[model samples]
Target chain A: AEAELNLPPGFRFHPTDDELVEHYLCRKAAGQRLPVPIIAEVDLYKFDPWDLPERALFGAREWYFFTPRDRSRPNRAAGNGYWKATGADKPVAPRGRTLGIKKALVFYAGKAPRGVKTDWIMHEYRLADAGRLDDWVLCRLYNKKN
Target chain B: AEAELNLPPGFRFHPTDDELVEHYLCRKAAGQRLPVPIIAEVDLYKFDPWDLPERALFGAREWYFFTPRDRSRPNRAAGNGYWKATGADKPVAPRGRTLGIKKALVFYAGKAPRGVKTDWIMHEYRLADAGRLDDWVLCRLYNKKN
Candidate 1:
């Protein structure tokens, strides 16, 4: 299901944390169709950050994906690199109450504990409720420009 | 029904012409409510542009309103002055087909034909289909900062 979005020039996927959760992730978890199919579902942990752009449906500088939470391990590692959490978890609450949690992660170029940090950054979002682990998680991957 | 939208800081309604028509105007024309009630419906022609901010539901500098078309008159006049068309109508086609028409208007400070041009500008939008004239039109009013 691939199609062109025909977004205007300079249009980027810079949705707010709340918008990502409310408009896209929450709808996907509830089995609702999104307004556009620009986001693709994939096992993000199976491929490195460099290999993600080719798998993405549509995006210029940033890409969005609906990834399933991998419960097989404590850390989510893709290829030889691991996604390391960089900051505190931000609460995504558009209606005053927290409905989702956003975590920022940075990709490493090598194995954990001694890996070199890369320019890749990921914003991982999941439902606030711990019991909703089976629900789909939304991830925004982008390379920070200097 | 009324609801409050908790938008983040620096958030402004700078939607494109196509977005204004497809996301806001067309949805409003189809009797659908937006996720946020930032845009209020009012008889915009009954008040001067200087008195609009107080009547707006939410806005910082620019405001949006849903106004009904006055089929009885050939011109749109508000309070002590009138709004005159400035340029040609621009077509808004978010999906590649002409769906709406946008017209730019300037607010005058006095009676027509002898009114003084002010810093106020309005971008009015209506469906392209002639039969949809009964539907409310969307207007974006803002001051041209010099």
Candidate 2:
């Protein structure tokens, strides 16, 4: 369900890789208080993108989710298509200290081999350094508008 | 012109009010190096939203502009519509220290007293402390999606 975040008007939860990982993800995994708890903690694998907007803590066209980091499989990743990878992984560092890695994916509808191109994209980020990683990952979902 | 930022993949120009004002506007006024040079420096009063997308350093669906904070009038503020103020002003503070004020507005087409409401929304941020202001204001522009 959507949330009524306490943030003031003109404020939105758009965070940088460093900000997200450093302030939210790491803080979450460490069991510390978040600067603000606007990110919903959900097992993204259990739901598809279509139903995710309602599940987010807050957002309009873009949404962010904090989900467990694991190799667990669920058919929901398809979200009607594929979370196909297409870019090189990049490192997320703050103050020049490497802290996490980020991966990009595009949701192609229809079929995997030649799924129809779509504007939906996702940037998944996780800590750089167990099973399930015993940690968390931050996923950003948005639809591209040309 | 759209700029190819040196940032890695999975990174976008979405920023918090504090980040945009502090890192972009403040550094700009002080002649300091910005963390990134993605925001465009434009006389917002000179251009309409339709033409702003390409001028931004980089961004899609959303765009950010850093313009001089001046009260001087320009016919362009009415980009074939009105920037009707709809919400209360909010203050932006980082680390609990107030730095700027934010105002929200919605673009309405056709008339003033009863201009047709549109999805175009803008969050205008300026430093709390000017005659021309001799400073910069950061504008975040986006179209709302349901």
Candidate 3:
């Protein structure tokens, strides 16, 4: 039997928090979005004032200012690199290997086998912006398949 | 002779295509904000059309993008967690510790660890809506020694 997932084990959905006010005092807010405390409590011990939480709701979360403590670390907050298109045409290659048909290039700093590298490989076809397909290629190449 | 630094070699301060044209083409063409690239070159021999590139350059090398490819493979683009911030905090934790301050997240397609993640790290920080640092806290964070 397919288990029921309409609500948490004991809770029921309300049309609006205002509606709940008529029946129960102090209910969750009616906004589609909720504050971080409403979703999950903030832990000052776990975070500093300028630290942005990873899972805060959009618009409802607090933004922070930060700087790299060490400019020498490769793991600093900023980075750079290049991306190569796959299945695009090479100078004299066939349709499956053309360059003009390829998509745009991207650059950033976060983590990797994703970005710049010596070589890359592909196994399917999709729009360049569809998702993080580029990083996947590098990950596979480096055998960093987490 | 002054002691040579341990920084990575070939790391001269050569400006990327974007920086070079920042004052001229980008500022003049787009009136301060340049449009993303219209074309990209990819090495498809190793990747599929569906795959994303680790990074790419746009408009004779003005814009760039970087993102992790594929969620199943997090380590490739994000170093084992494509969506976490890898930095330290105030008062400084002991060596090899972290405060885990994540600013943005990346997702792409392809295998893990080697996939080409692509996207800009600090661009989003400079959006007009965010504006410049007008307060001491913000200014301090922005101007911290690199």
Order by lDDT, highest first = 1, 2, 3
User: On residues B88-128, what C-alpha lDDT tens digit does candidate 1 reach at each position?
Assistant: 77767777453788888889989978999999998888887
Candidate 1 regions exceeding 4 Å error are A1-12, A70-75, A96-98, A130-133, B1-146
Please state how well chain A of candidate 2 matches the true chain A, as a TM-score.
0.78
Interface RMSD of 2: 9.1
Q: Please, what are the lDDT tens digits per residue for candidate 2 over residues A24-121?
A: 76767667787766778887755556677778877777888898763222212555666776576677775535376778877767656677767877
- Alpha-carbon lDDT of model 1: 0.73
In model 1, how large is the Cα lDDT of residue B139?
Answer: 89
Candidate 1, residues A3-117, lDDT tens digits: the string is: 3333322123556676777777777776777756678889887778989987888765678899888322235687679988888677777664437888888899788788999
**Residue A142 Cα positional deviation in candidate 3, in Å, after optimal superposition:** 33
Encode model 3's per-residue lDDT on A1-146: one tens digit a residue.
01122211211121121221211111121122321122222321222222323423221212111111210112211223333343332121222322111122222222455644432221111122221122111011111121
**Which should have the higher TM-score, number 1 or number 3?**
1
Judge the docking of candidate 3 as incorrect, acceptable, medium or high: incorrect
TM-score for chain A as predicted in candidate 3: 0.16
Tens digit of lDDT per residue, candidate 3, span B22-57?
322223223344332321333322332223223333
Decide which is better by DockQ, 1 or 3: 1
